[model samples]
Target: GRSRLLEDFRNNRFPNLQLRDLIGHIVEFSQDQHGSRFIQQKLERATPAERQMVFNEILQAAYQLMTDVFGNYVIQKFFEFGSLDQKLALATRIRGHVLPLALQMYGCRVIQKALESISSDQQVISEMVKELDGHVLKCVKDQNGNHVVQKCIECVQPQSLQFIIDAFKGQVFVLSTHPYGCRVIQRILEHCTAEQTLPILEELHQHTEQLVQDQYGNYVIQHVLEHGRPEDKSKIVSEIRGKVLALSQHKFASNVVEKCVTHASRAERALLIDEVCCQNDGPHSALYTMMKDQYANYVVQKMIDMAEPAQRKIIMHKIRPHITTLRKYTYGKHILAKLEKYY
Candidate 1:
């Protein structure tokens, strides 16, 4: 029966329904699992007059609906489809509840939508930022709250980002490993200024080894290597260059190594490849060892993919003697396949 109600809305069974009649059921439908979708559809396809009627009904209970599990989506539609005045009205209500709303599972999504929808309206952005000032770190660490914090970093102006960055002054490493916190750090790397990022990079430098192997922090390290300055990239490379072999064999650290190979300069790439492929222990070099490892094989293949002609030749020369050994195993077969394709 409920499915039929959703189907009716989808098929426009209410095309001739009066605005007042539809508006009357906003609350009942907004709270219904299937019914909320119908309201969202009407907002998207309904006539201007009818759409406004729904907007009017939503405004009366904007706060309550926004916090509702299902109703919040209908409120989000208002942000997406409602008039400027409607958006502002919602914004005004949300501005006062930034802290609590951002921490709530459903409310955080609505807040993110508002931030994204009105990114250009600095006045509104400032209000949201102003309210979230003291709680940025708390929000960044909360599973639900971190999403909105990242949205703010992305949608707010550069000047507005300073406060959020400042909040992480000494806790970059701690936050970088946090389930939700790591994302905020990645956002900074992706969106913030070089000067602003320098301090964060410097902080991470002290913890490069730890961060490189971290399940969540590794992504931050990869971002730095790919997008960080030449000096910053070299700083990280220098820290792990000696452990490339061990790292390549690591499940998580191996990914960081692949990024280094992919984004590093020709000379740096050569330096890294030489370390992995040139060990004197014939037939048992790090290249041979990694080629057989379940996780490390990916890094070895990446090295082959990005290696120069001569570099590839050198790698193949080292691995050539072990081809039979490599082809007999699963992970090794991958390297054999890659070698066959390239050679």
Candidate 2:
């Protein structure tokens, strides 16, 4: 008596049926894998009057289905293909539980889908963002919640997200070194306005020396060099100016050095090249030392690849005098091989 109707239908008594025929039992079917797919399948069509019937069933079990592995897709389907009032209603239901849903594995997708589908409703989005106010860092580092935060940065208005930026107030250096936390920092930098970014940038500059050497923090620095404005890029490039040879030898910092070589302004690059090409060899051979170190060789190669023709000619003049002694090490061989193409 409990599931007799679904059992009889699956038994093929009348096989050509749709969600419209199953009015009384939509909730029970929504939990089943095959049943959820049937609801999803029918929702794809704009058959509004009946779509409401399934949503009526879903409304009672909204939280349960949102947390369900197989049924969460049913909620996402309504957020996407279901009616407008239905979409806003689902967002309304998500109001009190933003933190839990943002952190749950499957439920996280529903939060993002609602955000993606409901940007037209800024009030709804800001209310959702407000719920995570004190716990922004928890979501920034979480496996599922990070994506939800990223969607907030990507889709929500910059003015309303100052809470997110403030949650990050003095924590930029610590966060920039975390694996997932680093990505969240990049997102804020990319999407937030200058007013929001000023404090974040100030904190990043405070730790530029240490962050450049860190394995994960290097990405944050490289991002600043690559996409940040002239003043921002210059601040980071200036830090690397005196330490280029040493930083380039590090496993991770080497990448930031290469990016600085590529993205630094033309005059800035020449000043950097002058630091490396100091017109000497043997006792303090900056160029030769970089060409032979394992990771730094790539930095030298980046200079070779991107240096202006006149600047490149200066590099060749310095290296050509040293090539006779360059043959012993593996890293020097890379520089030698790289030079054959250009010289």
Candidate 3:
């Protein structure tokens, strides 16, 4: 009887069987009769073609169970009466198995529509956000990043940022501080307005020391330096002095400094140098010296070399104070002692 039923389930003989009935049988057989192990033994004993046929039949039945019978029912019950963990588990299982198969026939937009139709519990939304966030960072590529950022922009509301903030409270510092997290924030900044950046900045500024360690802070500073007017840069410099100071030690800080020197006007450079160098750091110490010693000579020389005569005097004036400071400082000889052997 068992062999006949297995053959009927495997072959076309059971084509008319209701998918729910087959799923009930499979679940009960797997739990009570050890169906999976029995199927494995049968598979090993069968011919190659027979094994293929049995494999296809088993997959077909599994699909019907996951998709036609269990999926919507579980999802609905998950929304109606499930605990948060239950709902999350159900959603994750569906995301892993049902969604991929459905995507081939229904397309992602249709699948997204189905997911959207599910009841929007706060815990469900939070878990979904975290899953998407983790997926985006773990699978970083231009295409994936674009898709993830677009999804967040489209699906998540400003009110939801607070939800994300709350669910990820202590973890915020850990995630937001990562380079991948900074890229996500950059995407958010592109979509959000100054009003959003201001509150976020204020919240982060309260923990200035810890926040400076995050690449997101530096990314925002670069954004301000590139897009904001001088007043905005000035305000940022004033509000987050330690963070501004820390930027010089970052790996890309040299690029920012070069942008300032090459593109910024005399006034902007003055403001930037004031913000960066007044913090009494080593970089500032080196930079202040360079400016004062060669104010007229090097600025004019560099201008002449580059054919930017118009900016020569202004550049020299800006750099002269630092040149003098550098000349007076004895650290150059001390540095030479340490570095000369390497050269």
Candidate 4:
């Protein structure tokens, strides 16, 4: 991507060079790795005019550099350094190309920066996200575009971005199953308003049965407990009620139990730990299986950490017999360590 102009500069062609020396070549050098790195560094101390000059050059080649490896940072730089009108020009360059840029590997980073930078410019935020309106599902799952979608929730004012939530209408269960989609949904849960999350929560409740056990979907369930309201936690725990023994043995399902111990209401936490400590599932019981299970041991560990002294007394009775049994498996050693450390 470099030309002789930049290649020679790499060979130290212009030892006396100032920012002005690379004037016409700013765009040229920007397409290069080291050269792009130089400008971004120089930008920190760059005079307003120096930044202005480079901003003009970068804007002239906006679409190209917006997607270039080295040059994208050059544009991402402007969003960081400048004021209103200057930023407006940069946003203007990205004006109509939001979706494609958002989906491009390099352009996606630039889009994230712009959304983060232009939050004051609601018009800019509205325009960029609006372009992404119809394509929400595809974008939310894209490796590159997903980051931009996250920023939309993290950075955009919620009022302007309902399209994002609406787009996920019935898709929460489906999206929660995906790696990238879960992150987008996680951001929505974290950044979205209560009004916005209500619809999403409803969809999640409808599928709570399947969502809790899914390898990826469980994270969304875990997110609900961690970031959701007290009411929401009760709703989630309602589904978790009878499944304690069943879920404690599952890999991802244990996370819901862990978060429930840490964040769910006090009564719910009691009911949860009480279930495992006293379960009659078998001679081994829930606590026995959880202590020996890989991920499920983490839930047991959390329960011990969150349990009160009286609760600890009840929990200890269950583990007292397994002091020797725990030594048999690596998973139980984690529980044994807690017993060794705490008791």
Tell me how far the alpha carbon of residue 143 in candidate 3 is from the true structure, in angstroms, after superposition.
15
Candidate topping lDDT? 2
Compared with the true structure, what per-residue lDDT tens digits does model 2 show for residues 1-343? 4487777666776466777788887777777777778778888873788788888989888889998887899999998887678888898889999999999998899999998888645577779988988999999999999999888888888887889999998899999999888898998999999888999999999999999999889999999888888899999999998888789899999999999899999988877777787545458778878888989888999898888888788778778866766787778887887666767
Q: What is the lDDT of residue 180 in candidate 1?
A: 88
Over the stretch 1-343, how does candidate 1's per-residue lDDT look in tens digits? 3455445755778665444565566776787765787678767787888888888788888889889999999999988987777788888889788999999989998999998787555587688878988888889988889999898878877666888889999999999999888899989888888878878988999899999999999989998888888888888888778888899988889999998888888888889888887657455567777889998899889988888888788888778778879868788877888778866
Ranking by lDDT: 2, 4, 1, 3
Evaluation by lDDT, superior candidate among 1 and 2? 2
Error of 4 at 220 (Å): 1.2
lDDT of 3 by residue, 111-171 (tens): 2432454444445554454454433433223332433344444455554554323333344
lDDT, candidate 4, equals 0.84
lDDT of 2 at 26: 78
* Alpha-carbon runs more than 4 Å astray in model 4: 1-4, 308-311, 337-343
**Candidate-wise lDDT, in order:** 0.84, 0.86, 0.41, 0.84
Task: For candidate 2, report its TM-score.
Answer: 0.88
Instruction: Flag clash pairs in model 4.
Output: none
TM-scores of all models? 0.91, 0.88, 0.37, 0.92
Best first by TM-score, ranked: 4, 1, 2, 3
